[PDB]
Design a protein around this ligand. Structure first.
Ligand SMILES: N#Cc1ccc2c(Oc3ccccc3OCCC(=O)N3CCCC3)cccc2c1
Lengths: 406, 551
C-alpha cells in the first residue's frame, strides 16, 4: 500500500526515553518475540546513527508472553497528528448502554506500512543483564500497537470494514480507542454476546484477527454515608461532626449547630450522650441532603482528568475523578476477593478506573498513586493486562480523607 | 589498520554547516613533527591530502611526552554533528560475572583509526598544517577513518566491532566475549590448550578485518586492574582506598571522601556516610571549609578501622540460589550482604534515608529491600530471597495498617539482634477511665512568641509559654504537654491536621528534637488515643483550650 506521511509537532525532537532493566525471563521472551517479528518484516535492526529510544516491556494478557511498548512520550510529541489532524471522535451514548464489550484489534495495524521518514522515531532497545552487551536495537516498519497515530491512520479502513455491520445493527454503538473496540448494546446478555460474536466473525473473515464485559448503567458518583448507631459516644459525635464539616465543602446546605450543642462542655471521650430530637432531626435532614447529587460539575474537554486513589484496608480501595478539587465527576470503590496483595490490587484498580474513564469521556486520567515510585516501577508489569498506559505520579501525603470516603 | 567494514552514515544537525576554526601558529619544531606523523598516516590510508576547494577547518595542535602525538580539537565539529545512540554508560559489575576457567584480555590498537569514516562526512574533518611564518600555504588533510576525540567515534566503533565479531561468534557458540571500549574480554571452559588456540584464531579473524591484537607475549595477566577493581581468577575486590588526614576540610574534600567511601561500601561491609554527607548540605561553595561535626569524626574513625582490614568478593554461579541478608547498622543506617553460599559474599552495600523528617524502622527496612531488588535485577536479572531481622507479626501489622501499597517479597525471619520492632502503637478506640486532654497551641506570626495549653475533663488546665516558635511547632508542643502531665493512659483531642498527620504515621525517629521527645513519651505510655476535631466550630473542649490559649 501507500504510506501516509507523519510529522512531529514542529520544534520537537523524537523521544529519548531510558529503557528500564528487566528480569532475564522477560528479556528472553522479548528476544524470541522480536526475532519472529523481524522474520515477518515488522521490525528491523538499526545502527548507532539513530539516537532515539522508547521503553519496552513484556506482559501477559493467557500463558503466552506479549510485548508492550510505552509510547507515552512519542504520543505527546505527535499529538497534532492524532488529536486534531486525524482525530477519532468520541460518542456520548456509550456510557448509557447496558452492555459494553472490549475487543482487541491491534494485530490489524501490522498490515500497514509506516512512513519511511518516521520509522526512526520508533526505535527501541532490548536490554542486557549487567551491561554485558549493549542492547539489541530495532525500529518499526509497520504501524505499531500503542502509538496513537496507528488507529488514526487505520481509521478509513476500519470504517469500511464496519459499514456493513452498522447498517445491519443501527442501535449498536462502536467506539475505537487506540488498540480496542468498545461495542455497546441495550440487548439481553445472550443476544448481546451473539451480536458480538457476529462482529468477531465479520472482522475475521475480512482478515482482521482478534483474540471483557462492562455494564456502564451501574456507574455513578457514590453519595456519602453517615453512620447509623444505637449508642453514640462523644468520640462518635466528634467524628460525625468532622465528616459533616468536610462535606460542607461540596454540599452548601448542611449544618451541625444543633449537633455540636450535645458536646457543649468539656466531656470525656467515652461518655454516651443521647441524641436529642432536634439533633436527630438535623442529622436525618443531612442524610437527605447527601442522597441528592451535586450540581454545577461539568466535564471540560480542554482540561486534564485526575484520579485519586486511597487504600481502605481489607482489599478495598476508593477513588475520585475530577478536574478541579471537590468537583468530582465520578467517585467509586473497588474490592478484591481473597491470593491477592497490595500492588496487584492497585494495578487492577488503576485499569478499571482507566477503562471507565475511556467509556465516559474518551480519555485516560492522570493518576496520583499511593505507593513509593520505585516499588511501582518494579512491579507494575506483573499484573498489567491492558495495551495502553496512563500517566501517573506518586503521592506521599496520606490525608485523613481516607475515613471520609469510606 | 585499513578496513572493508561498511560505514555508518552521518549528518550534521539540521540547518548547521561545518566548522571553520582558524589555526593558531606553532613552534615549527612541532610543525616538523606533525609533517612526519601526517605522512605516515597518509601512507596507511588514515588521512588524505585535499585541494583548496574544501572550506572547512578544525584546529590541530601537537604535543610531546619520548615520542610525539597529534591532538585535534573537534569541539567545534562535535557541537555541530548529529546525536548518536550513546554507548553503554555503565560497566559490568564483578559480582555479576559468571565464573569461567580461562579468561583472556585483548586490547585492540589504533582501534578508531582502523574503522572507516562515512564518505560524505569527510570534508568536515579537514585540518591544516602551518607553514613557518605563513611563508607558504599550509598542508590540507582530511580524515578517512574515525578521528580520535570526535563525537561519533565511540559508537560507530562499537557497532562496527559487534558486526565484525558476529561470524566468529556463530562458529564458536560456547565462548564468552564481553566488549568494552577498545577492549575485548574472552573466557571459556576449554582446556587451557584449546583456549589458547581459539584465542589465536580470533586474533587472526580480527586481523583480517584490520584489528591488531596483542601477542601471547604481550597479553595482560591477572590480577587485572580494571575500573577501580582487582579481579583474581576466583575472587574480586576494589583497589586500595586511601582516606586523607587533614585538619581543615574543604567541601571538595568532603565530596571526594564520601565518594571513596561509597566505592568501598560495595564490598567492605559496615561503611557509613550519613553524618559525613549531612555536612555537604552546604553545597554553596566547593572551597568553603566545612567544620567537621563530632558525629562525623566518629563516623570517619569507624570507617578507618574497617578499611584497615582487607576484604574480597566472589563471582556468580547461576545454578546456586541468590540470598540477601540485612542488618540494622545505626540510627537510620542499614547494611546488607548478597551471597549464594554463606560467608562467600558476591557483594555488600548500605542504605541511609533522606525520605522525610520523620520515619520508622519498618518503613526503612522495606525501602532497603526495594533498593536491593532493583540492584539484583540489574546485576543478575533476578530477585534474591531475603533474610531479615523482623518477625511476620511485626511486618504484617505494619503493612496492613499502612496507607501506602507495599510489596513484601519471599523472606524469612533471622534471629540476630537488633530486631526490627514497633516501639509503640496508638489505640484505635477511645479509652474509658482515662483523662481526656483537649490541647491547642498558638503563636504570633510576627512576634514569633506563643503558648501551648490544655484543658481536661477532670477540670485541670494549664498554659505553658513559648518563645521563638511557629504555629506548627506549638500545636506539637501542646501534644507533648499532655503526654507529660497525663497518667499511663490518655485521650488527646487536637485541632491540628499537621500534628495529627505526623503522629498518626507512628514515627520512631525524627530530625526534630520535639518529635523525638514525644516519641520518648509515647513509648512509656500504656495507651494513647489521639482524636481530631475541626477547629473554631465550638465542639466542646476545643473551644475552651482555644479561648485559653487564644487570648
Ligand atoms: N581488565 C580487565 C577485565 C578482564 C576480564 C574481564 C572479564 O572476564 C571475562 C571475560 C569473558 C567471560 C567471563 C569473564 O569473567 C569470568 C569471571 C572470572 O572468572 N574472572 C577471573 C578474572 C577476570 C574475571 C569479564 C568482564 C570484565 C573483565 C575485565
Amino acid at each position: 500500500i501507500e504510506t501516509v506521511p507523519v510529522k512531529l509537532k514542529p520544534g520537537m525532537d523524537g523521544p529519548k526515553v531510558k529503557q528500564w532493566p528487566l528480569t532475564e525471563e522477560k528479556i528472553k521472551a522479548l528476544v524470541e518475540i522480536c526475532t519472529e517479528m523481524e522474520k515477518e518484516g515488522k521490525i528491523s535492526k538499526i545502527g548507532p546513527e539513530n539516537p532515539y529510544n522508547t521503553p519496552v516491556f513484556a506482559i501477559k494478557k493467557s500463558t503466552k508472553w506479549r510485548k508492550l511498548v510505552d509510547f507515552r512520550e512519542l504520543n505527546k510529541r505527535t499529538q497534532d497528528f492524532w488529536e486534531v489532524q486525524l482525530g477519532i471522535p468520541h460518542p456520548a451514548g456509550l456510557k448509557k448502554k447496558k452492555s459494553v464489550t472490549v475487543l482487541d484489534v491491534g494485530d490489524a495495524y501490522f498490515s500497514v506500512p509506516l512512513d519511511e521518514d518516521f520509522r526512526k522515531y520508533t526505535a527501541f532497545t532490548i536490554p542486557s543483564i549487567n551491561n554485558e552487551t549493549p542492547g539489541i536495537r530495532y525500529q518499526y516498519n509497520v504501524l505499531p500497537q500503542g502509538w496513537k497515530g496507528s488507529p488514526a491512520i487505520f481509521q478509513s479502513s476500519m470504517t469500511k470494514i464496519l459499514e456493513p455491520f452498522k447498517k445491519q445493527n443501527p442501535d449498536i454503538v462502536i467506539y475505537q480507542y487506540m488498540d480496542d473496540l468498545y461495542v455497546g448494546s441495550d440487548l439481553e446478555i445472550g443476544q448481546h454476546r451473539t451480536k458480538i460474536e457476529e462482529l468477531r466473525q465479520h472482522l475475521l473473515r475480512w482478515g482482521l484477527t482478534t483474540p471483557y464485559e462492562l455494564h456502564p448503567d451501574k456507574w455513578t458518583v457514590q453519595p456519602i454515608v453517615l453512620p447509623e448507631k444505637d449508642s453514640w459516644t462523644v468520640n462518635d459525635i466528634q467524628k460525625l461532626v468532622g465528616k459533616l464539616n468536610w462535606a460542607s465543602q461540596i454540599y452548601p446546605g448542611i449544618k451541625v449547630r444543633q449537633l455540636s450543642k450535645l458536646l457543649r462542655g468539656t466531656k470525656a471521650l467515652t461518655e454516651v450522650i443521647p441524641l436529642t430530637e432536634e439533633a436527630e432531626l438535623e442529622l436525618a435532614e443531612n442524610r437527605e441532603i447527601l442522597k441528592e447529587p451535586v450540581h454545577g460539575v461539568y466535564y471540560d474537554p480542554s482540561k486534564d482528568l485526575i484520579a485519586e486513589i486511597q487504600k481502605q484496608g481489607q482489599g478495598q480501595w476508593t477513588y475520585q475523578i475530577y478536574q478541579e478539587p471537590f468537583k468530582n465527576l465520578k467517585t467509586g470503590k473497588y474490592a478484591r476477593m481473597r491470593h491477592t496483595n497490595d500492588v496487584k490490587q492497585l494495578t487492577e484498580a488503576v485499569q478499571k478506573i482507566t477503562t471507565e474513564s475511556i467509556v465516559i469521556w474518551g480519555k485516560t486520567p492522570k493518576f496520583k498513586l499511593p505507593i513509593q515510585k520505585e516499588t511501582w516501577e518494579t512491579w507494575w508489569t506483573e499484573y498489567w493486562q491492558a495495551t495502553w498506559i496512563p500517566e501517573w505520579e506518586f503521592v506521599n501525603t496520606p490525608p485523613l480523607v481516607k475515613l471520609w470516603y469510606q | 589498520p585499513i578496513s572493508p567494514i561498511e560505514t555508518v552514515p552521518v549528518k550534521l544537525k539540521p540547518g548547521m554547516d561545518g566548522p571553520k576554526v582558524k589555526q593558531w601558529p606553532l613552534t615549527e619544531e612541532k610543525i616538523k613533527a606533525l609533517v612526519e606523523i601526517c605522512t605516515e598516516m597518509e601512507k596507511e590510508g588514515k588521512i588524505s591530502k585535499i585541494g583548496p576547494e574544501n572550506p572547512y577547518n578544525t584546529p590541530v595542535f601537537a604535543i610531546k611526552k619520548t615520542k610525539w602525538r597529534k591532538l585535534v580539537d573537534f569541539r567545534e565539529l562535535n557541537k555541530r554533528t548529529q546525536d548518536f545512540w550513546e554507548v553503554q554508560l555503565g560497566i559490568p559489575h564483578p559480582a555479576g560475572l559468571k565464573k569461567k576457567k580461562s579468561v583472556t584480555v585483548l586490547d585492540v590498537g589504533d582501534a578508531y583509526f582502523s574503522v572507516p569514516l562515512d564518505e560524505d562526512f569527510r570534508k568536515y574533518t579537514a585540518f591544516t598544517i602551518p607553514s613557518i611564518n605563513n611563508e607558504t600555504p599550509g598542508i590540507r588533510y582530511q580524515y578517512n577513518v574515525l578521528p580520535q576525540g570526535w563525537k561519533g567515534s565511540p559508537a560507530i566503533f562499537q557497532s562496527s566491532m559487534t558486526k565484525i565479531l558476529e561470524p566468529f561468534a556463530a562458529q564458536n557458540p560456547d565462548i564468552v566475549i564481553y566488549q568494552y571500549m577498545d577492549d575485548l574480554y574472552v573466557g571459556s571452559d576449554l582446556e587451557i590448550g584449546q583456549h589458547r588456540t581459539k584465542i589465536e584464531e580470533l586474533r587472526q579473524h580480527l586481523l583480517r578485518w584490520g584489528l591488531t591484537t596483542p601477542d601471547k607475549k604481550h597479553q595482560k595477566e591477572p590480577p587485572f586492574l580494571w575500573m577501580g577493581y582487582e579481579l583474581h581468577p576466583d575472587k574480586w575486590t576494589v583497589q586500595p582506598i586511601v582516606l586523607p588526614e587533614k585538619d581543615s576540610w574543604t567541601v571538595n574534600d568532603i565530596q571526594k571522601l564520601v565518594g571513596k567511601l561509597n566505592w568501598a561500601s560495595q564490598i567492605y561491609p559496615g561503611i557509613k556516610v550519613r553524618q559525613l554527607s549531612k555536612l555537604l548540605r552546604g553545597t554553596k561553595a566547593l572551597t568553603e571549609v566545612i567544620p567537621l561535626t563530632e558525629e562525623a569524626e566518629l563516623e570517619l574513625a569507624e570507617n578507618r578501622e574497617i578499611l584497615k582490614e582487607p576484604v574480597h568478593g566472589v563471582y556468580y554461579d547461576p545454578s546456586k540460589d541468590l540470598i540477601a541478608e540485612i542488618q540494622k547498622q545505626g540510627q537510620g543506617q542499614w547494611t546488607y550482604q548478597i551471597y549464594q553460599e554463606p560467608f562467600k559474599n558476591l557483594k555488600t552495600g548500605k542504605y541511609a534515608r533522606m525520605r522525610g523528617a520523620h520515619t520508622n524502622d519498618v518503613k526503612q527496612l522495606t525501602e532497603a529491600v526495594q533498593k536491593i531488588t532493583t540492584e539484583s535485577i540489574v546485576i543478575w536479572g533476578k530477585t534474591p530471597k531475603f533474610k531479615l531481622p523482623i518477625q511476620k507479626e511485626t511486618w504484617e501489622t505494619w503493612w496492613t495498617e499502612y496507607w501506602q501499597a507495599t510489596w513484601i517479597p519471599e523472606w524469612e525471619f533471622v534471629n540476630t539482634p537488633p530486631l526490627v520492632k514497633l516501639w509503640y502503637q496508638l489505640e484505635k478506640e477511645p479509652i474509658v477511665g482515662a483523662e481526656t486532654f483537649y490541647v491547642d497551641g498558638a503563636a504570633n506570626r510576627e512576634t514569633k512568641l506563643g503558648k501551648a495549653g490544655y484543658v481536661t475533663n477532670k477540670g485541670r488546665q494549664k498554659v505553658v509559654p513559648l518563645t521563638n516558635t511557629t504555629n506548627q511547632k506549638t500545636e506539637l508542643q501542646a501534644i507533648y504537654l499532655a503526654l507529660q502531665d497525663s497518667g499511663l493512659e490518655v485521650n488527646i483531642v487536637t485541632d491540628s491536621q499537621y500534628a495529627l498527620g505526623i503522629i498518626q504515621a507512628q514515627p520512631d525517629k525524627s530530625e526534630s528534637e520535639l518529635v523525638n521527645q514525644i516519641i520518648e513519651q509515647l513509648i512509656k505510655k500504656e495507651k494513647v488515643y489521639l482524636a481530631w476535631v475541626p477547629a473554631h466550630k465550638g465542639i466542646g473542649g476545643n473551644e475552651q483550650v482555644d479561648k485559653l490559649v487564644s487570648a
